[PDB]
Amino acid sequence: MMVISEKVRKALNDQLNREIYSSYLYLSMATYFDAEGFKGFAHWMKKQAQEELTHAMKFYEYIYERGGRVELEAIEKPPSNWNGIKDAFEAALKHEEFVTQSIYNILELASEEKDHATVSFLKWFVDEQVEEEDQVREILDLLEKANGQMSVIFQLDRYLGQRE
Amino acid sequence: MMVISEKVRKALNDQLNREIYSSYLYLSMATYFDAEGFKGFAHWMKKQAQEELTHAMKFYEYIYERGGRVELEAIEKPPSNWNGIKDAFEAALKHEEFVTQSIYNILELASEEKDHATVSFLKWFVDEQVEEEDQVREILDLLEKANGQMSVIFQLDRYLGQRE
Amino acid sequence: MMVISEKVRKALNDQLNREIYSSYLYLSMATYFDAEGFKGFAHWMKKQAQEELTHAMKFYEYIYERGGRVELEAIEKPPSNWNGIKDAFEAALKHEEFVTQSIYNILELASEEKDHATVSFLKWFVDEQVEEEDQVREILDLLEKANGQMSVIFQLDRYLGQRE
Amino acid sequence: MMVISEKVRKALNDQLNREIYSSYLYLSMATYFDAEGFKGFAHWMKKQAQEELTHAMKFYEYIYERGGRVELEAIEKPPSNWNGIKDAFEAALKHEEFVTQSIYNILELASEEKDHATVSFLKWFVDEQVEEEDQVREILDLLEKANGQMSVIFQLDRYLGQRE
Amino acid sequence: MMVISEKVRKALNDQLNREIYSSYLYLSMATYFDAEGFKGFAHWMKKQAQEELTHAMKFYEYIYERGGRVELEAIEKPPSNWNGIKDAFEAALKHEEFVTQSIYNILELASEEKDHATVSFLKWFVDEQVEEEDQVREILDLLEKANGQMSVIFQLDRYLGQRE
Amino acid sequence: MMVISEKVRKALNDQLNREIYSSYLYLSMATYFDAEGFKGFAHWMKKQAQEELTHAMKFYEYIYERGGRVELEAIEKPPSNWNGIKDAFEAALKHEEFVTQSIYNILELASEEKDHATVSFLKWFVDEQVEEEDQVREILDLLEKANGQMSVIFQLDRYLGQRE
Ligand SMILES: CCCCCCCCCCCCCCCCCCCC
Ligand SMILES: CCCCCCCCCCCCCCCCCCCC
Ligand SMILES: CCCCCCCCCCCCCCCCCCCC
Numbered sequence: 001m002m003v004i005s006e007k008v009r010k011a012l013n014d015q016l017n018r019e020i021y022s023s024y025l026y027l028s029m030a031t032y033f034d035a036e037g038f039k040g041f042a043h044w045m046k047k048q049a050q051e052e053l054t055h056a057m058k059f060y061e062y063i064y065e066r067g068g069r070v071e072l073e074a075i076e077k078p079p080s081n082w083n084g085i086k087d088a089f090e091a092a093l094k095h096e097e098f099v100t101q102s103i104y105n106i107l108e109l110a111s112e113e114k115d116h117a118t119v120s121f122l123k124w125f126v127d128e129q130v131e132e133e134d135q136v137r138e139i140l141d142l143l144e145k146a147n148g149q150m151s152v153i154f155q156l157d158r159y160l161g162q163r164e
Numbered sequence: 165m166m167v168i169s170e171k172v173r174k175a176l177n178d179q180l181n182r183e184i185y186s187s188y189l190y191l192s193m194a195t196y197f198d199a200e201g202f203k204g205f206a207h208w209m210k211k212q213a214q215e216e217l218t219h220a221m222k223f224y225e226y227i228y229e230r231g232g233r234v235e236l237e238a239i240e241k242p243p244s245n246w247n248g249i250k251d252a253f254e255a256a257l258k259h260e261e262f263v264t265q266s267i268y269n270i271l272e273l274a275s276e277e278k279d280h281a282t283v284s285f286l287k288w289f290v291d292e293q294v295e296e297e298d299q300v301r302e303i304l305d306l307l308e309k310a311n312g313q314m315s316v317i318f319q320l321d322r323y324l325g326q327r328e
Numbered sequence: 329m330m331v332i333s334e335k336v337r338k339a340l341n342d343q344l345n346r347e348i349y350s351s352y353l354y355l356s357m358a359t360y361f362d363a364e365g366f367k368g369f370a371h372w373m374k375k376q377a378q379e380e381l382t383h384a385m386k387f388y389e390y391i392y393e394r395g396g397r398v399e400l401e402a403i404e405k406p407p408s409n410w411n412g413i414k415d416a417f418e419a420a421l422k423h424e425e426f427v428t429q430s431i432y433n434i435l436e437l438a439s440e441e442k443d444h445a446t447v448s449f450l451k452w453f454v455d456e457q458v459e460e461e462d463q464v465r466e467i468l469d470l471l472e473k474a475n476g477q478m479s480v481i482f483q484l485d486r487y488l489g490q491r492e
Numbered sequence: 493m494m495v496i497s498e499k500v501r502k503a504l505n506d507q508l509n510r511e512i513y514s515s516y517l518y519l520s521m522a523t524y525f526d527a528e529g530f531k532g533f534a535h536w537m538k539k540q541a542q543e544e545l546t547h548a549m550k551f552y553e554y555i556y557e558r559g560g561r562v563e564l565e566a567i568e569k570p571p572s573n574w575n576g577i578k579d580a581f582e583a584a585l586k587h588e589e590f591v592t593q594s595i596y597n598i599l600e601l602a603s604e605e606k607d608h609a610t611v612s613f614l615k616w617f618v619d620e621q622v623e624e625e626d627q628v629r630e631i632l633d634l635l636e637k638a639n640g641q642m643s644v645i646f647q648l649d650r651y652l653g654q655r656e
Numbered sequence: 657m658m659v660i661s662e663k664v665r666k667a668l669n670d671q672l673n674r675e676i677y678s679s680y681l682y683l684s685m686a687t688y689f690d691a692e693g694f695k696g697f698a699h700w701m702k703k704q705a706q707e708e709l710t711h712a713m714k715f716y717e718y719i720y721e722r723g724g725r726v727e728l729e730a731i732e733k734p735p736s737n738w739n740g741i742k743d744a745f746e747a748a749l750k751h752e753e754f755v756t757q758s759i760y761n762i763l764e765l766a767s768e769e770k771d772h773a774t775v776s777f778l779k780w781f782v783d784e785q786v787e788e789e790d791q792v793r794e795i796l797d798l799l800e801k802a803n804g805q806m807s808v809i810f811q812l813d814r815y816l817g818q819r820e
Numbered sequence: 821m822m823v824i825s826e827k828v829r830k831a832l833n834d835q836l837n838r839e840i841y842s843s844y845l846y847l848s849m850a851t852y853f854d855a856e857g858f859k860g861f862a863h864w865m866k867k868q869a870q871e872e873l874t875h876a877m878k879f880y881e882y883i884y885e886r887g888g889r890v891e892l893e894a895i896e897k898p899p900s901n902w903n904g905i906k907d908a909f910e911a912a913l914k915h916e917e918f919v920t921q922s923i924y925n926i927l928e929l930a931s932e933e934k935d936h937a938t939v940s941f942l943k944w945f946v947d948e949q950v951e952e953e954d955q956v957r958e959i960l961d962l963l964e965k966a967n968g969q970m971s972v973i974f975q976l977d978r979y980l981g982q983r984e
Contacts, residue, residue: 003425003461020188028236031224035233046221057210060195065462070195072188075239097659104772116432120454126776133659134721141857142974151971201469315479318470331753331789352512356564359552363561385538388523393790398523400516403567444760448782529797643807646798680892687880687890713866716851725855728848731895 002067008115009068011106016059017073018102023052025095028078029088038153040161041085047163055125062121085153086143093136100129166231172279173232175270176223181237182266183220187213189259192242193252202317204325205249211327212256219289226285249317250307257300264293330395336443337396339434340387345401347384350427351377356406357416366481368489369413375491376420383453390449413481414471421464428457494559500610501560503598508551509565510594515544517587520570521580532653533577539655540584547617554613577645578635585628592621658723664771665724667762672715673729674758679708681751684734685744694809696817697741703819704748711781718777741809742799749792756785822887828938829888831926836879837893838922843872845915848898849908858973860981861905867983868912875945882941905973906963913956920949 002009026049033042060070082088103125110118139160146152166173194209224234246252267289274282303324310316330337354377361370391398410416431453438446467488474480494501518541525534555562574580595617602610631652638644658665686701716726738744759781766774795816802808822829850865883890902908923945930938959980966972 024236024239031234031236034224034228064198065458067465069199071244072192072195072242074241075188077238078236080235100773104770107772108770114432114436116435116454117428117458120451121458123451123776123779126772130721130773130777137723138857138859145857145970145974147970149971152974155974201466201473314473314475314477315483318473318480318483348516352564352567359562359564362556388526392526393786395793397527399572400520400523400570402569403516405566406564408563442760442764444763444782445756445786448779449786451779529794529801531794641807642801642803642805643811646801646808646811680895684892687892690884691889720854726851727900728844728851728898730897731844733894734892736891 002069004063004066004068004115004118005113008106008110008113008118009063009066011109012059012063012068012118013071015102015106016056016063016070017075018099019052019056019059020072021075021078022095022099023049023056024075025078026052026092028080029082029092031080032082032088033085036085038085038157040157040159041088044160044163055128058124062118066117086140089136089140089143093133093140096129096133096136100126100133103129168227168230168232168279168282169277172270172274172277172282173227173230175273176227176232176282177235179266179270180220180223180227180234181239182263183216183223184236185239185242186259186263187216187220188239189242190216190256192244193246193256195244196246196252197249202249202321204321204323205252208324208327219292222288226282230281250304253300253304253307257297257304260293260297260300264290264297267293330397332391332394332396332443332446333441336434336438336441336446337391337394339437340391340396340446341398343430343434344384344387344391344398345403346427346430347380347387348400349403349406350423351380351384352403353406353423354380354420356408357410357420359408360410360416361413364413366413366485368485368487369416372488372491383456386452390446394445414468417464417468417471421461421468424457424461424464428454428461431457496555496558496560496607496610497605500598500602500605500607501555501558503601504551504555504560504610505562507594507598508548508555508562509567510591511544511548511551512564513567513570514587514591515541515548516567517570518544518584520572521574521584523572524574524580525577528577530577530649532649532651536652536655547620550616554610558609578632581628581632581635585625585632588621588625588628592618592625595621660719660722660724660771660774661769664762664766664769664774665719665722667765668715668719668724668774669727671758671762672712672719672726673731674755675708675712675715676728677731677734678751678755679705679712680731681734682708682748684736685738685748687736688738688744689741692741694741694813696813696815700816700819711784714780722773742796745792745796745799749789749796752785752789752792756782756789759785822889824883824886824888824935824938825933828926828930828933828935829883829886831929832879832883832888832938833891835922835926836876836883836890837895838919839872839876839879840892841895841898842915842919843869843876844895845898846872846912848900849902849912851900852902852908853905856905858905858977860977860979861908864980864983875948878944882938886937904968906960909956909960909963913953913960916949916953916956920946920953923949 004012026045030042030045030049033039033045063070079091082091103122107119107122107126110116110122139156142152142156146156168176190209190213194206194213197203197206197209227234243255246255267286271283271286271290274280274286303320306316306320310320332340354373358370358373358377361367361373388398407419410419431450435447435450435454438444438450467484470484471481474484496504518537522534522537522541525531525537552562571583574583595614599611599614599618602608602614631648634644634648638648660668682701682705686698686705689695689698689701719726735747738747759778763775763778763782766772766778795812798812799809802812824832846865846869850862850869853859853862853865880890899911902911923942927939927942927946930936930942959976962976963973966976
């Protein structure tokens with residue numbers, strides 16, 4: 001039998017589908033950077049999309065570990081265009097903050113039910129949001145000092161294009 | 165400039181979005197096998213899902229090589245349930261034949277427009293479909309001989325669970 | 329001076345003694361499997377007994393780290409017999425669920441006394457119980473597909489006998 | 493089926509349960525030493541408990557080798573307190589000598605039934621008991637020699653804490 | 657945009673400054689032991705001072721991770737003398753227990769504001785405080801068993817002097 | 821007994837505390853650079869801070885080597901804000917020139933009192949000050965040629981972030 005409540009399973013399953021969309025969004029940011037000829041920024045976004053998928057699969061495996069089942073839902077069309085490099089990264093940061101708030105909501109739901117297993121499972125994602133939000137803020141800080149200077153954009157494109 | 169016609173770019177972009185869906189369908193087949201307790205069949209479907217993503221990124225990179233750009237569309241909800249192992253693998257076979265025919269249509273359109281560059285590019289996918297259809301047929305053939313014998317199904321699950 | 333409360337030290341010492349009993353119970357399940365001639369299942373139970381000893385010793389060392397003291401209590405006679413392989417596994421799963429709930433009680437006790445050190449110490453056991461329950465559920469699922477057919481029971485005996 | 497008499501099977505089964513207690517007693521001596529702050533003596537006692545477990549398991553496997561089966565019984569609450577280090581080690585010697593006589597009684601019983609297999613199996617424990625008794629006597633001798641000087645007790649605690 | 661509240665940034669910045677004082681305190685204890693000619697105890701205190709700096713720098717980096725900044729405050733003059741070795745270590749134990757309570761206060765504040773990121777970040781410091789308090793008690797227990805015998809003080813001096 | 825005069829013990833002890841403040845000042849400059857988003861300059865300051873600590877500890881050990889005693893004094897609150905990158909490095913240079921003059925004052929004092937050991941011991945610090953003043957002067961020269969230009973400042977930031 002399933003040892004998560006149906007309310008926590010649905011929250012976990014909802015977050016899994018949220019992570020699939022996040023991975024899709026970053027791929028669509030990659031389509032934008034490649035359309036604009038920034039292969040380094042695009043590469044960074046392709047790697048970010050891959051990383052979101054591994055988040056989704058950790059939700060996947062935890063649900064089955066607790067006797068639940070995953071049901072995949074429709075994935076909405078992401079935006080495909082942004083008003084330049086900095087605009088895209090601002091949309092990225094606002095998106096990560098939304099992901100953080102949705103993780104917090106599952107954590108508060110689980111602790112209200114005394115589902116300590118799920119509370120503990122979610123700590124990893126809380127810690128990762130701190131790092132992912134920070135990565136985007138640091139990039140935005142550089143774009144704000146760059147003030148559109150192409151000599152600095154180029155070096156930043158090549159640097160992010162080196163992401164492993 | 166873009167050197168593919170818009171018709172051929174649309175056909176290639178539509179196909180990229182079909183590979184994304186295919187990936188999502190195989191993941192959904194994995195949600196079914198894990199719910200049924202066949203983790204080796206599930207593992208096989210998770211690897212299949214990754215493989216279709218690499219097909220999508222191949223379309224992606226060629227589209228930008230030809231001066232086009234990619235637009236991600238919404239991903240329809242895949243089915244999540246089948247009436248057993250054979251049913252799921254038969255749904256996979258039927259899907260691969262649909263993907264194959266989709267590829268054929270692009271090839272016939274590109275060749276109608278004398279887009280020899282895209283005709284040549286598609287050869288890789290024609291050959292890949294031969295292998296992918298064959299792999300499902302092989303599993304269907306083994307499942308047919310197993311005929312519900314759990315002794316055979318167990319070893320089959322563990323063997324498919326070793327896919328790289 | 330002891331800086332855990334007497335109620336939290338008592339809860340921890342009680343849990344330590346529970347883990348000793350858990351180890352004894354699994355050893356007694358081993359006496360059952362060995363009597364029934366399943367040396368692989370018995371081997372699994374012996375390894376499970378050793379895992380519980382390490383749990384107890386972790387409670388042991390945290391109690392002294394916190395300035396407390398451990399007092400070993402009498403250990404009661406575990407059952408010696410089960411109505412079959414699954415009956416034994418079902419008993420193990422029920423016991424593991426009981427162990428999880430008693431871990432939850434110390435954590436809820438520690439959290440009300442604002443004993444954050446003990447709340448944090450217990451997170452490893454919450455995460456460990458998720459895996460322990462999952463292993464037994466997976467084994468129960470395979471015996472459930474095995475349906476008492478000895479050719480696959482033999483394979484599961486060999487598989488579980490390889491546990492390190 | 494069983495080729496030991498039930499009288500030697502129960503004698504062997506009693507000794508197995510005796511050895512489980514022996515291990516519990518040494519862990520309780522560890523709880524005492526850790527309470528007194530002698531982690532090296534406590535470490536030695538934890539290792540001594542481990543070794544008694546292997547003795548129990550050697551009886552365990554021989555019982556099944558001869559076609560019998562093991563039944564675990566309740567384990568008595570060991571003492572938790574002693575009036576000093578020598579007093580705890582004096583009780584250890586007290587007990588190892590009781591364990592030796594406990595083995596002698598099985599050997600004399602097996603020899604009366606002409607159960608030569610069980611007589612010969614017991615030779616190992618006779619030789620092992622000689623070593624374990626001397627182990628403690630040498631430790632007690634150094635304690636007498638220490639004459640309560642913490643300068644030498646600290647080195648003995650450090651020495652015994654090095655037990656592999 | 658700072659994503660810690662101002663009361664949590666202040667709590668964290670205050671704790672950073674407390675850690676700065678703590679290392680300074682341990683250095684001043686080192687000045688005492690060096691004046692008394694116990695270079696091993698002084699060496700231990702020098703290592704403890706360096707470890708508190710690493711604790712300060714982890715608050716430092718987390719504050720900037722969350723979008724805040726650090727403000728260094730004046731550091732009070734620590735005591736320069738103690739009534740003996742164990743008097744100094746007793747002050748150290750009382751100080752570490754004070755540091756632990758100040759970490760507890762930040763955690764309760766963060767969880768009241770539902771700042772799950774800071775609550776999770778603080779778990780490392782909760783666990784580390786358990787080991788820092790335990791380390792001092794073990795030393796006090798040894799100084800209490802030494803009872804001023806210099807034959808035992810000399811070996812504790814050189815023992816603590818090999819701290820890495 | 822002490823074989824430096826009290827007038828050189830205090831001059832040396834004052835300089836030890838002076839070096840502690842220097843280390844704190846450089847940390848404060850790191851808080852400013854990190855607040856401004858220049859992680860390379862911040863890294864340089866963090867390394868400069870720990871370099872000042874090794875200066876302090878060399879005074880520490882020489883004071884005890886001459887039969888003296890160290891007394892830690894209060895630490896003044898360092899400034900936290902500067903008008904810009906170059907102003908911070910200009911403040912660093914003016915501070916280093918002040919530290920050099922304070923070493924000069926100790927050296928002239930020791931010389932008048934014919935304390936040849938301290939005169940010779942201070943030679944290392946004189947030569948080291950030439951180096952520290954020179955590194956800051958070189959950085960100021962590049963910042964002056966940069967003339968506030970972010971493309972060149974970013975390169976200086978990356979270079980100084982590579983400091984070992
Ligand atoms: C090279 C980077 C490509 C990233 C593509 C991200 C696309 C996200 C939307 C589609 C996701 C559906 C399929 C997911 C399958 C995941 C399988 C993981 C197995 C471990
Ligand atoms: C050897 C494999 C089987 C082991 C079965 C153990 C069953 C539990 C016995 C009761 C507990 C006795 C005390 C054991 C203490 C061990 C402490 C080890 C510390 C290093
Ligand atoms: C060899 C022993 C060194 C002991 C140092 C004790 C320092 C006490 C606190 C003084 C102020 C410290 C300010 C500098 C912080 C340096 C941070 C280094 C890592 C970035």
